[PDB]
Amino acid sequence: GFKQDIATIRGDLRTYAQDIFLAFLNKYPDERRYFKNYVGKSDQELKSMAKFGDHTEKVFNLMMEVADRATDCVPLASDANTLVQMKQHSSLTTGNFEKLFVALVEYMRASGQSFDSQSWDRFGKNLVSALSSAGMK
Amino acid sequence: GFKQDIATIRGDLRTYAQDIFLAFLNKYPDERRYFKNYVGKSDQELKSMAKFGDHTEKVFNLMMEVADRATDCVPLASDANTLVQMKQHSSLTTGNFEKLFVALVEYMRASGQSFDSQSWDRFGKNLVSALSSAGMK
Numbered sequence: 262g263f264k265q266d267i268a269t270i271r272g273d274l275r276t277y278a279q280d281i282f283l284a285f286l287n288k289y290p291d292e293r294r295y296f297k298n299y300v301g302k303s304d305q306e307l308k309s310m311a312k313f314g315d316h317t318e319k320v321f322n323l324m325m326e327v328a329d330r331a332t333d334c335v336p337l338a339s340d341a342n343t344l345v346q347m348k349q350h351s352s353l354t355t356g357n358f359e360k361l362f363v364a365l366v367e368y369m370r371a372s373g374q375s376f377d378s379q380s381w382d383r384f385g386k387n388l389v390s391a392l393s394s395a396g397m398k
Numbered sequence: 399g400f401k402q403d404i405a406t407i408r409g410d411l412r413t414y415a416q417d418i419f420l421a422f423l424n425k426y427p428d429e430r431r432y433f434k435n436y437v438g439k440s441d442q443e444l445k446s447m448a449k450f451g452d453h454t455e456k457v458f459n460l461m462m463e464v465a466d467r468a469t470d471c472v473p474l475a476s477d478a479n480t481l482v483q484m485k486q487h488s489s490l491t492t493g494n495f496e497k498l499f500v501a502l503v504e505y506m507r508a509s510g511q512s513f514d515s516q517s518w519d520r521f522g523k524n525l526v527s528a529l530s531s532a533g534m535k
């Protein structure tokens with residue numbers, strides 16, 4: 262289930278973080294505009310840039326913390342607030358987060374590995390509601 | 399489902415509230431010691447008391463609001479805090495609530511009406527967790 266999925270992802274965090282992030286950018290290419298230093302760079306070029314592996318792992322580490330602190334896929338409002346008031350997220354809307362979770366779920370469903378993808382979808386919906394409540398447009 | 403069950407209970411609140419609260423007191427007769435003048439009385443006696451129906455309606459009125467404000471059967475922390483801080487609940491521990499929800503779930507399973515009894519069980523467990531988080535012993 263969802264708790265096992267957190268363990269699966271954490272076990273190989275750098276690989277899953279990179280693969281899911283690239284799945285997100287591939288499905289929604291116009292989203293790459295928010296990551297100016299990744300424009301025009303192939304996947305292998307990205308993975309040789311220190312900040313790409315660092316960014317992505319840290320993003321997914323925080324996502325996994327928020328996921329682990331949730332109850333029945335309902336995140337803490339305090340965690341939603343952290344995400345909204347990060348300077349790096351200042352120009353985002355809940356739609357950018359909905360896109361990430363659509364890509365993450367699609368990726369889970371397409372993988373060899375046995376994810377509770379319904380629960381990630383629900384977590385994503387609950388997180389979007391909470392981001393909105395914490396002031397994200 | 400859970401959401402509709404809230405509407406079902408609200409639609410015949412004083413009847414369901416008395417029936418469920420009676421199921422609780424009959425399953426756990428020692429729980430009458432937190433209340434005044436309940437011992438030594440049959441169900442019909444209790445239901446003709448001045449205060450029994452009124453008190454018990456007020457309990458279920460609030461229980462249904464807590465359930466309605468929940469997401470995925472997870473109550474709000476502010477609702478848990480209210481229940482912990484109420485002067486009328488100063489003698490209570492989370493075990494008292496656990497027992498109430500066990501009886502409530504067992505009433506729903508036995509009833510002729512189509513309740514989502516698994517969701518009420520989850521809600522009760524999540525409420526006990528939230529009461530603990532809010533500092534109830």
Ligand code: HEM
Binds near residue numbers: 323324
């Ligand atoms: C739950 C979802 C997300 C979590 C947990 C999250 C977490 C983070 C974290 C922890 C950082 C800082 C990393 C660092 O400084 O090394 C960050 C940076 C950033 N995030 Fe988010 N993020 C989320 C969703 C998004 C989405 C949906 C977008 C855009 C579509 C976005 C765009 C950015 C950008 C542009 C940066 C700056 C790049 C960097 O220096 O790391 N993030 N994210």
Ligand code: HEM
Binds near residue numbers: 458461486495498
């Ligand atoms: C979600 C569960 C519960 C809710 C929403 C709740 C709500 C309330 C409310 C609104 C009152 C005020 C009633 C009034 O003054 O008319 C109350 C009183 C009280 N409650 Fe709770 N309650 C809950 C669980 C419990 C449990 C598990 C116990 C004990 C086993 C308990 C014991 C009392 C007592 C002793 C009073 C005052 C005496 C009385 O009303 O007869 N309640 N409850």
Ligand SMILES: Oc1c(Br)cc(Br)cc1Br
Binds near residue numbers: 364
């Ligand atoms: O910050 C994130 C982004 Br941007 C995309 C995906 Br997919 C996951 C996270 Br966390």
Ligand SMILES: Oc1c(Br)cc(Br)cc1Br
Binds near residue numbers: 422
């Ligand atoms: O009002 C309640 C009483 Br009195 C006991 C249990 Br257990 C649960 C509720 Br709600």
